[PDB]
Design a protein around this nucleic acid. Structure first.
Length: 49
RNA sequence: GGCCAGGUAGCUCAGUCGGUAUGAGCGUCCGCCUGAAAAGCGGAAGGUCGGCGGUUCGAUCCCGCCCCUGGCC
């Protein structure tokens, strides 16, 4: 199982950093697809059904 | 007032009684291509699955109410 407490924490850190680095709304839609969509690493944590 | 059967992407519609709707056709975007296009090929974006709540670590899928449609009255 690849869902250690140090795995989800680092994945969110890369997500919140890219979300905070989103300067315009068009970049936020790109970051949302890479960190909150159905293909994001956090989605893979939920893809592991 | 009765059990039901339906509301799902921009349009028209499939599909699951619990963790991915690997949704389809068309519509939108990018690349190859063209003077510029389209088709073709190769990549993608986009749904909070009818609303408000209830159970659950987790609900499009189960309880309740209602919003709106047919059905049969």
């Amino acid at each position: 199982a690849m869902l250690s407490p140090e795995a989800l924490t680092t994945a969110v850190d890369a997500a919140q950093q890219a979300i905070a680095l989103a300067d315009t709304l068009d970049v936020l839609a790109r970051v949302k697809t890479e960190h909150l969509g159905d293909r994001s690493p956090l989605a893979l944590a939920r893809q592991a059904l």
